[PDB]
Amino acid sequence: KKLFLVFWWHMHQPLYREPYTGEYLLPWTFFHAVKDYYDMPAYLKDFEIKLNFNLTPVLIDQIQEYAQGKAKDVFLEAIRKDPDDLEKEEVEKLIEFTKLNYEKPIYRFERIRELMNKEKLNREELLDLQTLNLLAWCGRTLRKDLKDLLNKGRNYTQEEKEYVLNKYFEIIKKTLSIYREIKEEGKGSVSTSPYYHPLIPILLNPNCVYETTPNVKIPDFAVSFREDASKHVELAKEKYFEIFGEHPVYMWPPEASVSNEALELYYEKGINMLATDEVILKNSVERASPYLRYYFRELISVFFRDKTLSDLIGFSYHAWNAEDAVRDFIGRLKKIHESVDFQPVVFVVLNGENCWEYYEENGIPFLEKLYSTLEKEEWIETLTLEEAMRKEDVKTEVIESVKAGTWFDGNFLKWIGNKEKNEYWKILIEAKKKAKNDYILVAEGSDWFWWQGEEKAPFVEVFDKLFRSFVRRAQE
Ligand SMILES: OC[C@H]1O[C@H](O[C@H]2[C@H](O)[C@@H](O)[C@@H](O[C@H]3[C@H](O)[C@@H](O)[C@@H](OC[C@H]4O[C@H](O[C@H]5[C@H](O)[C@@H](O)[C@@H](O)O[C@@H]5CO)[C@H](O)[C@@H](O)[C@@H]4O)O[C@@H]3CO)O[C@@H]2CO)[C@H](O)[C@@H](O)[C@@H]1O
Numbered sequence: 001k002k003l004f005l006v007f008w009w010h011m012h013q014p015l016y017r018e019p020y021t022g023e024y025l026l027p028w029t030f031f032h033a034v035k036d037y038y039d040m041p042a043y044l045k046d047f048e049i050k051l052n053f054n055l056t057p058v059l060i061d062q063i064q065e066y067a068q069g070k071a072k073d074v075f076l077e078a079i080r081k082d083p084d085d086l087e088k089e090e091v092e093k094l095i096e097f098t099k100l101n102y103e104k105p106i107y108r109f110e111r112i113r114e115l116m117n118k119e120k121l122n123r124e125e126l127l128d129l130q131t132l133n134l135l136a137w138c139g140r141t142l143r144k145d146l147k148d149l150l151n152k153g154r155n156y157t158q159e160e161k162e163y164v165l166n167k168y169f170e171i172i173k174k175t176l177s178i179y180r181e182i183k184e185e186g187k188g189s190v191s192t193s194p195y196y197h198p199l200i201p202i203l204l205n206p207n208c209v210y211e212t213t214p215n216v217k218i219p220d221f222a223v224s225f226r227e228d229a230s231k232h233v234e235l236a237k238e239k240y241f242e243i244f245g246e247h248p249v250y251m252w253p254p255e256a257s258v259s260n261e262a263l264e265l266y267y268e269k270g271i272n273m274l275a276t277d278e279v280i281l282k283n284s285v286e287r288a289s290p291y292l293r294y295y296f297r298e299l300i301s302v303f304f305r306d307k308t309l310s311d312l313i314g315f316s317y318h319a320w321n322a323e324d325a326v327r328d329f330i331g332r333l334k335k336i337h338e339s340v341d342f343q344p345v346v347f348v349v350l351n352g353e354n355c356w357e358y359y360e361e362n363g364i365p366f367l368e369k370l371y372s373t374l375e376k377e378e379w380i381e382t383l384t385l386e387e388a389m390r391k392e393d394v395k396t397e398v399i400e401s402v403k404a405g406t407w408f409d410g411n412f413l414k415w416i417g418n419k420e421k422n423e424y425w426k427i428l429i430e431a432k433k434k435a436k437n438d439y440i441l442v443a444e445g446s447d448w449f450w451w452q453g454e455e456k457a458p459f460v461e462v463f464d465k466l467f468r469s470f471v472r473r474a475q476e
Pocket residue numbers: 010011012013014028032255310311314349350351352353354355407408409414446447448450457458459
């Protein structure tokens with residue numbers, strides 16, 4: 001009797017490319033490409049397990065632009081320059097970026113602490129600040145190759161910084177090829193999402209928010225977004241086909257977001273399986289075991305992720321010693337294995353790039369220990385999405401209706417339903433009436449609404465500038 005374990009690592013960035021200048025206004029796609037997007041599939045070269053990945057089309061576009069040398073990334077330009085050529089504004093931006101990342105374990109360099117404690121920085125100090133900001137985002141592969149430069153910790157020269165940059169761009173240029181390779185070798189399945197990561201259930205039917213939050217106020221949806229919902233899915237299928245040569249049959253719904261209407265749309269678009277969150281199952285049925293394959297109206301297969309396990313990795317284990325965290329995770333799988341007489345399917349689904357910056361050494365000791373341990377436990381079989389979809393010796397159940405929601409508490413409150421988020425929707429609704437190009441689709445991405453109307457939010461003004469620039473461009 002096996003336990004079937006399915007990892008599905010979701011990779012996404014909103015479009016940081018300002019449409020009028022072409023400038024990438026934040027470096028997050030670059031930094032997660034060099035830290036996570038190559039290295040997460042690359043674990044499959046060293047560990048004999050299956051791991052699955054979701055890549056959004058808008059992320060793929062940006063990886064392609066960086067790989068082609070075409071991305072004009074304003075923060076990265078300030079890193080590359082000789083410090084003697086740095087603008088006053090660029091020095092301020094380098095300092096602020098460091099301050100915002102300062103407490104993350106991947107920034108634990110003694111030299112960064114000294115530099116931040118200085119009033120004015122000379123050329124040699126700025127070179128270290130530039131290069132250490134680069135090296136903080138070093139991924140597993142290059143932590144081996146650049147080991148000696150990493151152990152320097154200070155006193156970096158322009159030549160050394162340029163060397164690091166060249167190795168980083170080499171990783172980016174190989175990234176889409178590693179996803180093709182692990183897919184063709186059967187080491188994992190690759191899925192995609194509707195193109196700009198929108199909330200499909202809201203685009204199809206804004207009133208579905210009232211299934212979980214009846215007291216919420218929403219704007220007047222005086223225009224239909226239903227055909228845009230279809231476009232996001234269709235364009236995503238075409239982009240995936242561009243990269244991999246086949247149409248996708250698995251999709252990750254952005255924010256785990258499903259509704260009866262959304263599931264019908266994914267079925268109509270030829271999607272054979274998706275996953276969503278355990279809270280949706282709990283809201284939709286009484287007997288909510290997430291260890292079964294579900295069939296929605298015999299049209300599409302649905303798995304519900306194990307929320308506990310997914311959130312342990314995504315939010316809890318950064319605060320743990322790595323061996324203890326692996327012991328805890330394996331112990332939880334053992335208890336699931338002992339708790340049922342059938343073979344349970346255990347979906348672990350979360351973002352593949354967001355939690356690691358908070359782990360010691362970018363979570364590399366944790367993942368290496370976790371993957372090494374899993375590959376030797378003969379009662380665990382990790383599966384591709386294709387294998388999870390086909391497995392005959394699992395329990396199944398038919399489901400006829402779901403209550404619409406997301407993996408955020410089963411509801412949509414992170415993107416709609418307060419004064420400030422509703423103004424964004426009102427802006428989008430009015431722009432849609434006058435839209436003349438697909439930049440309206442860019443503005444439908446979930447990220448813009450995530451950041452709106454939130455205190456904290458690092459670089460909130462940049463996301464607001466991007467959203468409103470896409471809204472403006474869509475009407476020209
Ligand atoms: O400067 C701002 C900000 O920018 C950059 O962050 C990027 C991310 O790197 C990028 O991935 C993208 O983030 C979006 C995710 O792609 C999207 O999936 C969603 O992820 C949020 C988390 O969702 C789940 O967590 C849920 C819990 O499970 C549940 O308990 C409850 O807590 O709710 C959570 C959902 O809200 C996944 O489990 C978890 O792993 C995900 O992390 O939304 C993201 C935001 O739209 O885009 C952002 C920028 O928009 C930069 O990389 C980051 O450090 C920086 O602060």
